[PDB]
């Protein structure tokens, strides 16, 4: 349904809100999500220290947890809580996954520099010499 | 060495340059990288369609490729090409990995909505009803 | 049901058809799949550039996409399109996953040779010497 | 060096030899590898039941093992044993990884058929009806 | 439901039973599981050599297999067989995943020692010297 | 070298010490490790909140970090710190990886029970009925 467009709008809203860049009733949902987060996020991290996705997370785990959100009934408030929870999950996941990805590539580059390139750089006057030439 | 601080500066420069947000001689390197990219990136994607990292990429593959960059000697130009290559690798990797991550979480949420929540939403007047109440 | 035997037959048919080796109504399905592919695959890659599986693809993503294949109704033609889509997905996935796997092992071997073995090989007359002896 | 072309030739030789399809001194190496395998593979699986790669295998593990192959010296025979070992590793890895990949996609398809498609198929005369029409 | 508490109890029972440490009707289920395992596990490994999880196993594969356990009907015996199967799956998965994890970290440490530390250790009298000092 | 036997002994010592079960100078190293941990682990978690391995951690990251342990020289104390660090890394990694693995399998089982089995269980008197029969 348009449920996915709803989800996508909420997720990109929350992501851009926390300062992540990559380049209808949706409004009411954005605002209710904000309101919820402003009221309840201290009230949700003391037993909610889960935070993070692993690349091998199954949908069934997600389902079980959110199931305990809806165990004794669906109202609009817990739907909002659901969206907010998904958004927090998203923000955290991309945060840490981006840390590890960039860290991996940076580590690789540092390694290659230190093995194959630093000798030459030392026998040619170091980076100083560089900024002289291609400065 | 300070090689890693160099690498990190270049990577965050290139990432923020392509519009990715998450919240010395470094200058000469930034500029030489830019210059290189402005001169050679059409000249590098016709046999350079590799682009992407897999979560199971080994450093040895990276090493072999960059090795073919330095096969017959190290000069400053190919060092710059090395940094630029690493930056392109980074940008592409985070781009696509972020697409798949966010897509996964969004798919999960859409699924849960459509299985456990949409019935109730239909028996309570739909999202219209929602924007009436928590509007 | 026998749905899985159907699926498996179609997948191995399509894989062996594209030249991949590893060592009923099924016929009508093979032929309809072929026919479909002969009619529509230029008509499916301009907005269908997805191609590839990641080891961390969820069933929910697959479900959402194929859902947009069946959004306004099931007929036999879109069932055939479904099978063909699955087969294309399979072929592409194994193609690229095999590239990266073999590339990883090959890179490892090249590395080990170049670190631990090439010295000795150079102090014993090189591979020429080898083909003299164990030739 | 040309070490990688050596490795690649040996790997594709061994893979095509075991019947896997995807579409110099190399000869002496192919033959010595064959000879080795014909002499020693019963002599190598009783304490060599390792077989398989995981997507998260490090080069360091590979290095340690092959290190125990070369612990007290490099001769041509153990170089050949090295290539043969790498080839066996490759063949096994692609074998099992292909099993799990194809099995995953097939399982997905079976699932989707059984949830979204089989009802309709039952209300339209089943696959028999299909082979009548698009036969 | 309390189905998950059931599952969790059975899994931790079976894990602690095989000697894995990490720090109601449940009883009847534990005992029936034991009884089942004592009667049928030779009768289940000749065509049941699957054993292992990959980090990229989908729930759909699990579902298909267990589906063939329940193909022609649910009775209590096959429910017990289901729990026992899940427990075996668990034990095997953690066994092998723990082997590979610990092996990876150990390999890393061995590598670092042999590259950065062993020189110094040799120029300072070796580990003997160590047990003299911090003994 | 025997460096790996050293590493393995230390790792299994530390793991069994924290209560994990799976079924020379080594002593001086065990004791020095213990001593170190008793003196410094409050002094190491305020800027050392890293803890965890991802299945896609490269050796190069490990190398860079431990490199900052040895930046201005190798003495025996920092070798001990190295072993202790590796052991902590191991314990944490297996802890959390075991949590997620067992949680995944348990979630799968709960799901299957709730979809395919719970209906039948409700039409046959529930688990009470079970403990009557196979009690």
XYZ file of N, CA and C in Angstrom, chain D residues 64, chain E residues 99 102-110 113, chain F residues 1-16 22 26 29-30 83 87 90:
105
model
N 48.139 -18.670 8.236
C 48.616 -19.556 9.299
C 48.647 -21.019 8.832
N 33.985 -21.560 17.105
C 35.264 -21.971 16.536
C 35.823 -20.901 15.597
N 36.714 -17.316 17.511
C 37.922 -17.395 18.328
C 39.155 -17.631 17.453
N 39.003 -18.456 16.421
C 40.097 -18.715 15.489
C 40.534 -17.441 14.772
N 39.570 -16.602 14.400
C 39.887 -15.342 13.735
C 40.696 -14.429 14.649
N 40.203 -14.216 15.866
C 40.917 -13.327 16.787
C 42.321 -13.860 17.119
N 42.414 -15.168 17.343
C 43.692 -15.814 17.632
C 44.679 -15.661 16.474
N 44.179 -15.815 15.251
C 45.001 -15.648 14.058
C 45.522 -14.219 13.959
N 44.638 -13.254 14.205
C 45.032 -11.848 14.217
C 46.167 -11.595 15.204
N 45.987 -12.076 16.432
C 46.983 -11.878 17.482
C 48.325 -12.519 17.129
N 48.279 -13.761 16.653
C 49.483 -14.461 16.216
C 50.220 -13.651 15.153
N 51.819 -10.404 16.688
C 52.999 -10.836 17.429
C 54.165 -11.096 16.484
N 55.149 -19.529 14.730
C 55.909 -20.003 15.881
C 54.984 -20.588 16.940
N 55.509 -20.745 18.149
C 54.702 -21.170 19.285
C 53.898 -19.982 19.814
N 54.060 -18.837 19.151
C 53.272 -17.646 19.438
C 51.780 -17.938 19.398
N 51.358 -18.764 18.445
C 49.943 -19.086 18.322
C 49.470 -19.990 19.454
N 50.325 -20.897 19.915
C 49.947 -21.755 21.033
C 49.825 -20.893 22.288
N 50.723 -19.918 22.407
C 50.655 -18.924 23.474
C 49.302 -18.207 23.449
N 48.999 -17.606 22.300
C 47.747 -16.881 22.082
C 46.521 -17.722 22.420
N 46.491 -18.942 21.895
C 45.373 -19.853 22.096
C 45.191 -20.194 23.576
N 46.293 -20.508 24.256
C 46.227 -20.785 25.689
C 45.661 -19.593 26.453
N 46.166 -18.398 26.159
C 45.700 -17.204 26.860
C 44.209 -16.957 26.617
N 43.781 -17.123 25.367
C 42.391 -16.888 24.989
C 41.437 -17.868 25.667
N 41.785 -19.153 25.663
C 40.926 -20.146 26.305
C 40.935 -19.982 27.827
N 42.073 -19.559 28.375
C 42.161 -19.255 29.802
C 41.177 -18.155 30.171
N 41.270 -17.035 29.460
C 40.410 -15.889 29.726
C 38.936 -16.189 29.481
N 38.646 -16.988 28.458
C 37.262 -17.341 28.156
C 36.660 -18.236 29.232
N 37.384 -19.281 29.622
C 36.892 -20.178 30.664
C 36.814 -19.454 32.006
N 32.424 -24.712 26.079
C 32.071 -25.179 24.744
C 32.067 -26.704 24.688
N 53.394 -19.745 29.630
C 51.946 -19.575 29.561
C 51.364 -19.195 30.919
N 52.248 -15.657 31.838
C 51.443 -14.790 30.986
C 50.007 -14.687 31.490
N 49.451 -15.816 31.924
C 48.119 -15.846 32.520
C 48.072 -14.936 33.741
N 48.054 -8.883 25.033
C 47.356 -10.142 25.273
C 46.021 -9.924 25.991
N 42.232 -10.714 24.689
C 41.337 -11.552 25.469
C 39.995 -10.895 25.742
N 38.068 -10.903 22.582
C 37.522 -12.240 22.376
C 36.256 -12.470 23.196
